[PDB]
Each structure stands twice: as structure tokens, then as C-alpha cells.
Design a protein around this motif. Sequence first.
Motif, PDB file in Angstrom:
ATOM      1  N   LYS A 217       0.774  -1.231   0.000  1.00  0.00           N
ATOM      2  CA  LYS A 217       0.000   0.000   0.000  1.00  0.00           C
ATOM      3  C   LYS A 217       0.800   1.271   0.000  1.00  0.00           C
ATOM      4  N   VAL A 218       2.058   1.273   0.404  1.00  0.00           N
ATOM      5  CA  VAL A 218       2.918   2.451   0.419  1.00  0.00           C
ATOM      6  C   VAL A 218       4.257   2.056  -0.197  1.00  0.00           C
ATOM      7  N   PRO A 219       4.278   1.639  -1.468  1.00  0.00           N
ATOM      8  CA  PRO A 219       5.460   1.215  -2.173  1.00  0.00           C
ATOM      9  C   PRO A 219       6.547   2.244  -2.255  1.00  0.00           C
ATOM     10  N   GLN A 220       6.213   3.540  -2.118  1.00  0.00           N
ATOM     11  CA  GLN A 220       7.274   4.534  -2.172  1.00  0.00           C
ATOM     12  C   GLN A 220       8.222   4.453  -0.987  1.00  0.00           C
ATOM     13  N   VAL A 221       7.914   3.718   0.079  1.00  0.00           N
ATOM     14  CA  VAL A 221       8.760   3.604   1.246  1.00  0.00           C
ATOM     15  C   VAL A 221       9.920   2.702   0.908  1.00  0.00           C
ATOM     16  N   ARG A 222      11.134   3.106   1.259  1.00  0.00           N
ATOM     17  CA  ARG A 222      12.342   2.336   1.017  1.00  0.00           C
ATOM     18  C   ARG A 222      12.859   1.750   2.306  1.00  0.00           C
ATOM     19  N   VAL A 223      12.695   2.438   3.429  1.00  0.00           N
ATOM     20  CA  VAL A 223      13.128   1.931   4.722  1.00  0.00           C
ATOM     21  C   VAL A 223      11.914   1.926   5.635  1.00  0.00           C
ATOM     22  N   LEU A 224      11.552   0.757   6.139  1.00  0.00           N
ATOM     23  CA  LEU A 224      10.353   0.681   7.004  1.00  0.00           C
ATOM     24  C   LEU A 224      10.801   0.166   8.355  1.00  0.00           C
ATOM     25  N   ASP A 225      10.474   0.927   9.401  1.00  0.00           N
ATOM     26  CA  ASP A 225      10.893   0.497  10.747  1.00  0.00           C
ATOM     27  C   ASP A 225      12.351   0.187  10.818  1.00  0.00           C
ATOM     28  N   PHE A 226      13.218   0.977  10.250  1.00  0.00           N
ATOM     29  CA  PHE A 226      14.665   0.879  10.180  1.00  0.00           C
ATOM     30  C   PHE A 226      15.211  -0.380   9.554  1.00  0.00           C
ATOM     31  N   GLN A 227      14.450  -0.965   8.658  1.00  0.00           N
ATOM     32  CA  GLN A 227      14.846  -2.171   7.921  1.00  0.00           C
ATOM     33  C   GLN A 227      14.575  -1.901   6.429  1.00  0.00           C
ATOM     34  N   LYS A 228      15.474  -2.199   5.539  1.00  0.00           N
ATOM     35  CA  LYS A 228      15.367  -2.032   4.118  1.00  0.00           C
ATOM     36  C   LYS A 228      14.210  -2.721   3.429  1.00  0.00           C
ATOM     37  N   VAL A 229      13.323  -2.028   2.703  1.00  0.00           N
ATOM     38  CA  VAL A 229      12.265  -2.834   2.043  1.00  0.00           C
ATOM     39  C   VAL A 229      12.973  -3.622   0.947  1.00  0.00           C
ATOM     40  N   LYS A 230      13.011  -4.934   0.961  1.00  0.00           N
ATOM     41  CA  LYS A 230      13.681  -5.741  -0.059  1.00  0.00           C
ATOM     42  C   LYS A 230      12.739  -6.238  -1.153  1.00  0.00           C
ATOM     43  N   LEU A 231      13.290  -6.584  -2.315  1.00  0.00           N
ATOM     44  CA  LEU A 231      12.550  -7.080  -3.472  1.00  0.00           C
ATOM     45  C   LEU A 231      11.676  -8.283  -3.159  1.00  0.00           C
ATOM     46  N   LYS A 232      12.285  -9.256  -2.463  1.00  0.00           N
ATOM     47  CA  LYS A 232      11.516 -10.443  -2.094  1.00  0.00           C
ATOM     48  C   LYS A 232      10.270 -10.037  -1.321  1.00  0.00           C
ATOM     49  N   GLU A 233      10.325  -9.045  -0.412  1.00  0.00           N
ATOM     50  CA  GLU A 233       9.128  -8.663   0.328  1.00  0.00           C
ATOM     51  C   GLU A 233       8.125  -8.029  -0.622  1.00  0.00           C
ATOM     52  N   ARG A 234       8.602  -7.233  -1.573  1.00  0.00           N
ATOM     53  CA  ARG A 234       7.711  -6.585  -2.537  1.00  0.00           C
ATOM     54  C   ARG A 234       6.956  -7.663  -3.316  1.00  0.00           C
ATOM     55  N   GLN A 235       7.666  -8.634  -3.866  1.00  0.00           N
ATOM     56  CA  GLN A 235       7.014  -9.716  -4.599  1.00  0.00           C
ATOM     57  C   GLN A 235       6.002 -10.420  -3.717  1.00  0.00           C
ATOM     58  N   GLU A 236       6.387 -10.802  -2.497  1.00  0.00           N
ATOM     59  CA  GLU A 236       5.506 -11.492  -1.573  1.00  0.00           C
ATOM     60  C   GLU A 236       4.258 -10.700  -1.253  1.00  0.00           C
ATOM     61  N   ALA A 237       4.390  -9.381  -1.272  1.00  0.00           N
ATOM     62  CA  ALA A 237       3.275  -8.493  -0.993  1.00  0.00           C
ATOM     63  C   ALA A 237       2.460  -8.320  -2.265  1.00  0.00           C
ATOM     64  CB  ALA A 237       3.797  -7.179  -0.440  1.00  0.00           C
ATOM     65  N   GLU A 238       3.032  -8.693  -3.403  1.00  0.00           N
ATOM     66  CA  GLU A 238       2.338  -8.601  -4.682  1.00  0.00           C
ATOM     67  C   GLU A 238       1.433  -9.839  -4.728  1.00  0.00           C
ATOM     68  N   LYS A 239       1.891 -11.001  -4.276  1.00  0.00           N
ATOM     69  CA  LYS A 239       1.042 -12.183  -4.291  1.00  0.00           C
ATOM     70  C   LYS A 239      -0.125 -11.784  -3.385  1.00  0.00           C
ATOM     71  N   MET A 240       0.045 -11.946  -2.087  1.00  0.00           N
ATOM     72  CA  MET A 240      -1.009 -11.568  -1.141  1.00  0.00           C
ATOM     73  C   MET A 240      -1.494 -10.187  -1.516  1.00  0.00           C
ATOM     74  N   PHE A 241      -2.765  -9.858  -1.611  1.00  0.00           N
ATOM     75  CA  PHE A 241      -3.253  -8.538  -1.970  1.00  0.00           C
ATOM     76  C   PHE A 241      -3.224  -8.207  -3.461  1.00  0.00           C
ATOM     77  N   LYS A 242      -2.726  -9.044  -4.349  1.00  0.00           N
ATOM     78  CA  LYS A 242      -2.682  -8.771  -5.773  1.00  0.00           C
ATOM     79  C   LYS A 242      -4.007  -8.252  -6.322  1.00  0.00           C
TER      80      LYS A 242
END
Lengths: 85, 82, 81, 193, 79, 67, 119, 79, 94, 162, 86, 74
Positions: free
Chosen positions: J137-162
Motif C-alpha cells: 500500500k505504500v510502495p514509495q517507502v524504502r526503509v520501514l521500521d529501520f529495515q530495508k524494504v527488499k525485493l523479495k518482500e515486494r514480490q511477496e506483498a504482490e502475491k497476497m493482496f494482488k
Amino acid sequence: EEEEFNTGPLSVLTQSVKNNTQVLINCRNNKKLLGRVKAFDRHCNMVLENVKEMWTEPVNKDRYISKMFLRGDSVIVVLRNPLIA
Amino acid sequence: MKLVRFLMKLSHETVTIELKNGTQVHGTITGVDVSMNTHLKAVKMTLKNREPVQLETLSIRGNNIRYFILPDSLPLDTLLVD
Amino acid sequence: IGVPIKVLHEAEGHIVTCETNTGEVYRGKLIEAEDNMNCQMSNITVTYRDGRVAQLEQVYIRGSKIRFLILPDMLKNMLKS
Amino acid sequence: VKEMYDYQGRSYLHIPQDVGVNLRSTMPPEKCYLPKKQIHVWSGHTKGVSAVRLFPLSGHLLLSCSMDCKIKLWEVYGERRCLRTFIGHSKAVRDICFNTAGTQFLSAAYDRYLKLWDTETGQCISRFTNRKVPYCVKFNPDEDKQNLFVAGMSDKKIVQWDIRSGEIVQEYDRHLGAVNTIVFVDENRRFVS
Amino acid sequence: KRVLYVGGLAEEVDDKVLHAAFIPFGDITDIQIPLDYETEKHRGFAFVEFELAEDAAAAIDNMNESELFGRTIRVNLAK
Amino acid sequence: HPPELKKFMDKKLSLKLNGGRHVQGILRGFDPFMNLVIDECVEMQNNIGMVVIRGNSIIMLEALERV
Amino acid sequence: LRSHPLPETAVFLKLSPESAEEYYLKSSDRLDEAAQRLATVNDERFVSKAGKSNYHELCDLISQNPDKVQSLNVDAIIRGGLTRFTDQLGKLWCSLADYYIRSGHFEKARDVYEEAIRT
Amino acid sequence: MVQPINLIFRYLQNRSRIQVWLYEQVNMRIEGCIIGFDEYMNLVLDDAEEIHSKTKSRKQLGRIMLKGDNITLLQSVSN
Amino acid sequence: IRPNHTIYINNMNDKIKKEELKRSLYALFSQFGHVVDIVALKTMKMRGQAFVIFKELGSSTNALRQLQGFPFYGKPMRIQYAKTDSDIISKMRG
Amino acid sequence: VKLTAELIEQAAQYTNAVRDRELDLRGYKIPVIENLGATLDQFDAIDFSDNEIRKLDGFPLLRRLKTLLVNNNRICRIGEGLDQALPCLTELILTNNSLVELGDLDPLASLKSLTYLSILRNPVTNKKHYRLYVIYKVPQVRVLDFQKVKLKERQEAEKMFK
Amino acid sequence: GKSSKMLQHIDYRMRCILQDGRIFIGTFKAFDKHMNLILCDCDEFRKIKPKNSKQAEREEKRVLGLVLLRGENLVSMTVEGPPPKD
Amino acid sequence: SLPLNPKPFLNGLTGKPVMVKLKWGMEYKGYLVSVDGYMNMQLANTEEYIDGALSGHLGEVLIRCNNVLYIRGV
RNA sequence: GGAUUUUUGGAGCAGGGAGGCAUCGACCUGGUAUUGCAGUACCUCCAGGAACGGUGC
């Protein structure tokens, strides 16, 4: 001061006014002004007569200006020659 | 000698002035001062690559002048006397 | 000494904006202004020609290489001249 | 008064900086001039100043000797302020000299004593003995040996003093009667008494 | 050009009187009155600082040689 | 007049010069024209040592220290 | 005064009503502003009269006298004399400018004030 | 404190080879041994060279007097 | 090592660029009090470390106890009171 | 202790440790964010930590505001027009507040420059899939809770919620 | 002689042209030897000086406020409008 | 040499073949007739080298001082 | 009353061309090193990606 106008590099201008001879002025605007020196000063401001202005735009261009005043900062070079002859 | 003095005599003449930035100014001289700061009236001024604009008055910082084109009629030999 | 210069010295201690000859824009507190327009400032925000900002603690800009300054309107109220 | 310290911790000697021109300055300022107008009275002293000397390197400070047994430092720029007063001689102070570096300062008086001073505190660092009244005293100019004092005595001799020991290093007996003044014709190598 | 010297003050004049007499010209930021602690009274003068220099100027023009507590006062730029 | 730079003496500085040129070094001195002596100077990076900068071509300086 | 500042930001007739309702010297300057606004006639002079009621004041009234010179004449002169400044020759200069173009028996009276001790 | 003029006087005495940054021209710099100089920072350089930073090419000049107008910066080089 | 205004952090992921590290450090530590300044270098010697300086001492102690081993950019940070007083603190005190 | 113009004018103003102009509005017990007009858009950062604000809303148009530190308040809702008043908002620190439902974080999708986001110590954190929900829902975020948003998480979030 | 040529336009609204080609319009309140200028209620224009351009008169206008301009960078000035009374 | 200054250097070079580079990259070779206090320069039998190549043979020439980059004897 | 804090000034002149090339810098995936008490060009290394960003012709 007159001595420095008379014998120094500005004697080019001093000589042109005295002999009513032509000089070509290469100019900062990339233009050249060809004519006679009626008056000049330290800064190389000049009052010029029978000025042929020449430039380029390639295409060459020119235009006649009988009477005009040149602010001397625009001077790059001033040339005396067998031009008047 | 000091040629600005000569220009200071040209009040009420109409001239064309070419500027360092290429702009062309045609108007009637109200005053030239010692710094060659020039003031005019009834001025048609054409910045390079525009159509002219008319101004009732215009004041030029002296250093920005390239050259003045004077009236053909102008009696220079008179004006060069001090 | 020039009338504008006196008004500049009056702005010492105030927040002012300065544009250079190269168009970088410096905003912060004017500490010292010299007669020749040399300007010491502090706690600056600088806005470059590309739009990006930065932050500086201390700066000093040469008068000649200043294009202009914006001063508070607190000063506007030298009407004699 | 309330001098104590100035600015943020700057000494009353360390930097000239403010005055028109530059103290570090090259040796020949220009073709020289002679003055008509007098600017500062200074005063303080109720008796004629014995002597006046400027400051090592460039004329940053000026220092005066009073026959009231007193020594005063001054702006030397026509400025009102006189820096820190020094007191500690019994009898009128006859002559002084400065540390080439400029931190130490030496005074000789008719009380038969010679004192080494801290120009930054006014502290009498060291006092040198001997029965004879000491006339003109100089500090070795050489960077290598800032330590050595050379004191001319009324009693013929000139004496070198090791500042650190306080002991006599070298006596010069050749001279007759009193010694008036000592200079150094070439630094370190020679001097003319 | 915001600080004014104000002299010729009668003994009854104090910082309150000065505030009231000069506030008609504009807001004031400070009022200083040197005191003689041996007597506890002021020395006959004070410095009034206006927020705006233009207001300080108007005050000088209208208050110099004016009357305050029965006597003439002197007002001018302090420095 | 002198430029008021005594405050900046023996401090590390960042110097913006004309031509889009930038150098960094310690202020060792100046004159009324604002010509500078800069020690341990670095062209922005390559070390150039102690250098003279002509005040003419000085756009801006920024202290890298607290004055 | 902050409300006067916000009202100044709001600022012309209704603003003049807000200012006159708001209305020491600042009220007089507001009155002079009311005169400058009203004159933009005789009612403005009436505003100058109310400004005189507010009271500096003398200066403002003198300026107003400059705006309307032949308007009141002797009454205006009386307003001058009624002011009462202990020195205040400048008023004598005002009467002098008034006489350059006024004359009359009144000019002689103005000259007589001139006799009054000062310098 | 070191004064800039003095630094030059030092360069002169040392006969250190000097590299000059020119005004508003980055692609070329000038090199040489300062023999003398004047109040306008005009320099007399010996065995001088134009240095093309872009072309890695050097132009040999010999006896040069460079107007000070062009001086941006003065540095020393070991060569 | 007595309580200090400055805390020393080590065991930090050194792959984060310096300006980003400092800005996240500032953000994370702002929850306990005003952070006056942060010193962090990427030299061989100093990489993976940072000094965080707080105005209030109680803030430093709270930060230390609450964020001990907090996962930051993937690694558990180790916090300790600094050995010496920070230059900025010494200047602000005297 | 209303957040007022007068309050803002006497507030500590300084250049912070990350070289930005910051205004200090800490510990005033402010309940509602209002009257920001008076800052005149002169700050890169505004510190609202330790206050009692309930909703991140009420901002004027502030073009220079890039960092908002809102630690230890009572934020339970995020206003809907935030990008229209804060176009360059790049960092938002919301640690230790009251956001409880994933849907309450939805308004942050409209902050186009938002790159650094911190929502730790909020009840919402313990909701199933909280991290993936924020990432999608907020893909423009690069660092969330002081942890790097990684590609694998983006893909995983693309499945769930697609 | 008179020195008035600048003093005449003082207090007036003035259109000033900069060396880069910007247009500064403000109230001309002060000048000096160098032609450093003091401009009250000053705005900057870039694209045009309007003579009633039917599309619009104003694009890239910026409110600046109280401006001191250095004379080095000044080219020219014309009268834009009369003095505001205030 | 023991200090050789701008002014004397130029004076020694009067009567000599010189080349002047201008800031604008033009070059002018000729006999230096004279120089003045402001370092304006007068050449005779001048030649113009632009791109280092002979362009024009010009004769007697005044060069305004502000244009000069450097002067070389040659 | 033209010789460095006003008023006899050190100013000045110079930018369009085209619809790929050169340099600088973050930068993005993987993986990998580092656990050290700081005040800063920049900061691990290895491989891959640049329909990225700026400057000049």
C-alpha cells in the motif's frame, strides 16, 4: 599624459586622429568597425566617422554609420594600416 | 579628452544605442552623467529577439552601453571644443 | 558610505536571503555585513540551481559575487532620503 | 580595573590583527614619512619614563619603564587601554628587554636586581642576584639560546646568565669602568659593548 | 537608530512615566534609567529603545523640548 | 579595509570557486583583496599542499569547523 | 495592538470605521490617515478636526493647513494661535507663507505675533 | 599568519615550479618558475607550459608574462 | 564506565551510506530526548560505529537500556556509555 | 496549551545534527496540530515528540517540510489530504503512538516522496501481515521500521493482496 | 548639474532589468554611487513584462518583499507605476 | 635570475618579436613597439594565429590591456 | 575637497548548437566482510543491472 598618448600604444589612436586615417576595430560583439577616429580617450571610447560595421551571421554582413560613439571596454583590437590609402 | 563630457552635451538629441547584451534603444536623451549613465524619453527599445516596446522613460547604467549611433546632422567639431 | 549599505548593516542579526552570481540561494542569520557587501551568515539553508537543499552551520560570501539580498520587512519603516 | 582576560581567551600580546596594515608585514613598508600631529598622552607615570620598547616581531604592544618602580603595557595603536601593570622593584627601573619569541620579559633596576617576567600574567618568574647595579640588559636573540641573559654592569664586567640554572655562565672582565650598552651586531655571533 | 537619549527628567519621572509618555509613537522594547544607589534616585536621564527606527524618529521630533512633569526635556538619538 | 576573517584563521574550510571549482583546506592568512593562503589544500580528491587563492575568484567559503 | 496590526493587514471606509472605533499618538496617525483617505473633501478636514480633538497633533494640523490654504483663513490662523507652543517659530513661518499670498489687516496681526519674544 | 603575497615571494625565492589555475578556463592551466612579480599579481614565468587537462597535451612557451587577471589559484609542483 | 550524555554504538551494518545511517540514527533515538549530534565515520577504524549525543543525560540512559540489541538494518546493535565526554558537551558546559 | 502562533515564535529554532532547519515543539502537551502558517514554511524538520496529538492532520501548505518526528503522542488517525499540504514529506517517524488498524495507515499511500517510515510501538505492528501490507500500500517507502524494504518482500506483498 | 535623474523616480514603482534578463518590479526607495538599489514590495518576473497579453499577463511571478539589488547586475529602469500613498 | 619583474621584462622585450595570447584564444605575433602603464600593447608587422595557424597578416596593431592573457617573446 | 571606508569608477567582453561521444557521482539485485566509543569529500569486497541523475561539444 599627452606624452603617454603620443608615444605609448595609444599613439595608434593619436596618429589616426591627426592624419584622419582609417582604422579597423575588432570589437567584443564579434563585429568590426572600420572608419576614422574623430576623438578618443584613455578607455578607448571613440567618436567615429564614415563607419563601415562588418560582421558575420555562414553569411557576411555590413552596414554604413556616418556618426557614432563607441564605449572603449568593447575594444579588443585596434588596427592601423595602409587602409586609408 | 574626457569624452563622457561630450556625451553630456547631447541632451535633447535623439539617438540609437546598442547595448552589450545586444538590446537596441532609440530615444531622446534627457541626461548623461559622469558614469555614462544615460537617461532618455520617448523610447522605443528592442531587446534582441523581440518586437519593440515603447517607454516614456528609460535609464541605462553606463557600463551596459556598447555604442551610440549619433544624428547624421550632429556638428562634432563644435561639440569637441571645451 | 552608501544609503543601501547602512540599511544592510541594520539587518545584521536578522534572517536574510542571499542569491549569488551563480544563483545558489542562501537563507539564514546575517552575523556581519562589511562595507563591500562581504556577508557572514549562520545556520543556513541553501537551495541550488537544480532545486535541491542543504544545511550549513557557518558561511561567508564575497560582496562582488552577490547578485542580491532579501531583508526583513521589519526594516522598511531612512525615509528622509 | 577588571581586565583579567579579553575576548574568548586571547592574550594581551598574541595577535595584533585589528589595526590597518599587517604586523607580520615585510621589512620595508614604503618610502617613509615624518609626523606632525601628536595622538596619545598615555600618562600613568608620575615620573619620566626611563625607557620605551615595542614588541618582538611587530609593534603590537608597547612597554614603558617608570622610575616609580613600575612597568606598563600599552596598545601601541593610540588605544586608551594600558594592559597589565607590573610592580616588584624597590628603586627606579633602569632598562628592559624582550624575549625574541615574545613571552618572557626582562627588567633591570638600581636595586641590584634583575627580574624575569611572564608577559601574560605579570608573574615575577625569576630574580638574579649580584652586588653591582646592573645597567643595560639584553636577551640573547638567537633561537637556539633564548635562555642566556647578557647584563652590563657598572663594575666593568658583562655577565652571561643561564636562565634555567640562574647561575653565572660567562664573565667578561676586559672592559674598564662602567658598561653602558650592549647590542648584537650579528645575531648570536657577535655584540658590541 | 532605535535608541533615544532622554534628559531633563524630574525626580518623579520613572520607567512607568516614560513608557506612558513615549508609547504613543510606537511600541517600546526597553527603558533604562541609571540610578545612584547612595540616593536611590535616578540621575536625570534615561535611554528609550523603540521597536522601529521610524517611530524613534517621530518621537524625537515631537518630544524634544516638550514638557514632562513641569519641565523641558531633551530628546535625541543616543548614538 | 580588511575582510573580517580572523575568526576563520587556522580552521578547515570549504571553498567554492568560479568555474564550478571546489577545494578544501586550512586558512593560513589573507590580505585586503581577500586573497587567501590555504594549507593542506585538496582539489575536489587530490592533495595539492599549501596554495594561494586570488580573492577575485572566491565565490563563497563555508567553515567545516565551529567558529 | 496586535488586533490593530491584523486590522492593518485587513486594510478602506469600513477599515476606517474599524480604526476610528479602535481609537495615543497612533490614534492621531490613524486620524491623519482618515483625512488622507477622506480627501481622496471638507469631510476629510472634519476628520482633521476630530484629529485635533484627539490631541505631533500640531504638526499634523499644520500639514492639513497646507492642503487647504484659502479654505478657512483667519479661523485657521486662530487654530494656529490657539495651539500654544512656547517657542514654535515654524508656525510663524507658516503665517509667513500664508501672508506671501494673503496680506490684509491679518498679515499685520501675523507680523505682530512675530514681535513676540523668542529669538 | 602567512600573507598570500609573501607565499609568492617564497615561491620566487624557492624557484619551485608553479601551476596556475586560470579564470573561467578549466581545460587549460599554466605552469612555470616565477622569476618576478608585481603589485597586480602579474607574474614572470620561466620555461612555461600550457597544460591541457582534457588532451593531456603540453605546449611549450619559454619566457611568459601572465597577466594576473587570469589567476584563480597558485600551487607548487615537484616536477 | 559511568553514565554519559553520549552513547557508543557498535555492531552496525556498515553497508548503509553514512548520511542515511546518521539520519536513521537520529530518527530512532529522537524518541528518548533531543539528540544534539551524531559522530560516525566509515574509516576502517571507525566503520560500524557511532556516537549519539543527547542534551539530557536521563535520555542517554533510557536509550541505552531500551534499545540494547535492537535490530537495525538487520543487525542487533550493541550500546554502551562512551569512554570520554563529547567535545560538543564540553563546550556547551563551559 | 494550544499550538499557537505565539508558541511557535518563542520555540527553540536550530540547525540539527543532520544539517536541516528544525523547529522544536517537544513536550508542550499539544493536543491538536494547528496554526503552522506562522512557521512561514521555513523548516526542513519539525519535532513534535512527546505531545498529546491524536490526528496527523491540520497542516497548511508547507513546501519545505521534509521530516516529521512525532514520537510519543497519541496518533490514532492520519488525515486524508496530507500530500496536498506536504508534497515533499520524505521522513515520517511515528514510534510509540496509537495506530491500531492496517486500514488507518492507508492515507500514507498518497505521500509520493515518503521514503523513511517508522511505525514501531504501535498496536498495528502486531497485526498479521502488517509489514507486507505497508509495502504494497505504500510502495514509495524504502526503509520501514529501520529495515530495508527488499525485493523479495515486494514480490511477496504482490502475491497476497494482488 | 541637478543629480535629480534618480531622485525624481524615488518613491515610485519601478521596472528594473537585471543582467541575466530578470525583471524586478518594486518601489524604488534608495540608491547610491554604484546604483545599488532598495526595492520595497518587490516581485520578480521571468517570462514576460505584460502589455495586456490576452492569454495571461503573469507567469513565473515570485513575491520577494524588501530587496537590495547590487548595481553591478543592474542594466536599466523604467517607470512602472506611481508611488503607493502609504 | 635575481628578481626579474613584469615591468622590466616587458621593457626588455620592446624592440623584439613577441606573441600575445588573448583570453579569447586569438594569438598575435609581431614586433613590440611599446607598452604602457596599464599594459596596453602596440605591435608592428603583426600576424594573426588562430588555432595556431596563420590566419591574417595585419600590420600595426593596438591591443587593449584587459584582453591580454599572456605575452611571450619568440 | 581625482591616491585604499561614498562623488571623478577596474572595469570589460563573451553562449548558441543538435535531436550520438567523454567524464563525475550516487544507484538497484544477489552474495560477502567488519562488532571497533564518534564530530565526516566519499567509504567492505565480489558478480550482475542501469528504458538513472547532472556538466560540456
